[PDB]
Amino acid sequence: GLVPRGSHMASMKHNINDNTLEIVVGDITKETTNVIVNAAAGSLLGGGGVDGAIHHAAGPELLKACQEMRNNELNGEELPTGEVIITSGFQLPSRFIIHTVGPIWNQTPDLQEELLANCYRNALELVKVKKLSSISFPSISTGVYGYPIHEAAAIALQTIIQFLQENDVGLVKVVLFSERDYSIYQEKLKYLIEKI
């Protein structure tokens, strides 16, 4: 699966308002939060990484749902960078998948930080208004799309943290299949908490 066998397991939890932010090493396709987030492609065709794993786990109905959403909600266009759509999770233990498109590193350097942050803000706004109680995010735009992990992780955490300071959402997880990524997130979060 996404988490290499024998990876170090680890968790960190912190409350913000009556919200909770959790960082964990894990396989996001096995998360039991109400929502998980897919780091998708504009095409909403499944690829590799988290996107591939989510489609494999969710089953074939996901691709079909996504392409009709593209046809109906998006009028046949790709999902724009930073925007979101929601579908069923199908065979996933999570009820819903929010699909978002992260910026591809340095394609639009002037905009990309705001666009990556939009992924987070739009997903949380959706959770808020639909009262979905819990959501798991993966690392978005990172990889060999990739976005340097320290920079991506700063944008994610700061955006999530401010949103949780200002809103009732519930439980937000960042679920990472890499203990390397987790360690960066853990230390950065502790650093950001200290500032609040």
Written as six digits, the tokens of 167 are: 């809103």
CATH number at residue 53: 3.40.220.10
Amino acid, res. 108: T
Catalytic residue among 18, 51, 110, 181: 51
HEC profile of 123-175: HHHHHHHHCCCEEEECCCCCCCCCCCHHHHHHHHHHHHHHHHHHCCCCEEEEE
* Lookup result for tokens 């699909």: 99
Give whole-number Cα distances, 134 to 51, 73, 89, 173, 178, in Å: 20, 24, 14, 8, 22
Q: Which domain holds residue 51?
A: 1-196
Task: Tell me whether residue 50 is annotated as binding.
Answer: yes
Task: Tell me whether residue 46 is annotated as binding.
Answer: no
Task: Tell me whether residue 11 is annotated as binding.
Answer: no
Task: Tell me whether residue 145 is annotated as binding.
Answer: yes
Q: How many domains does the chain have?
A: 1
User: CA 95 to CA 169: how far, in whole Å?
Assistant: 16
Handedness of CA 70, 175, 56, 132 (dihedral sign): negative
Q: Does residue 51 carry a catalytic annotation?
A: yes
Task: Tell me whether residue 144 is annotated as binding.
Answer: yes
Query: Judging by beta carbons within 10 Å of its beta carbon (0-12, 13-18, 19+), is residue 129 exposed, middle or buried?
Result: exposed
Task: Tell me whether residue 168 is annotated as binding.
Answer: no
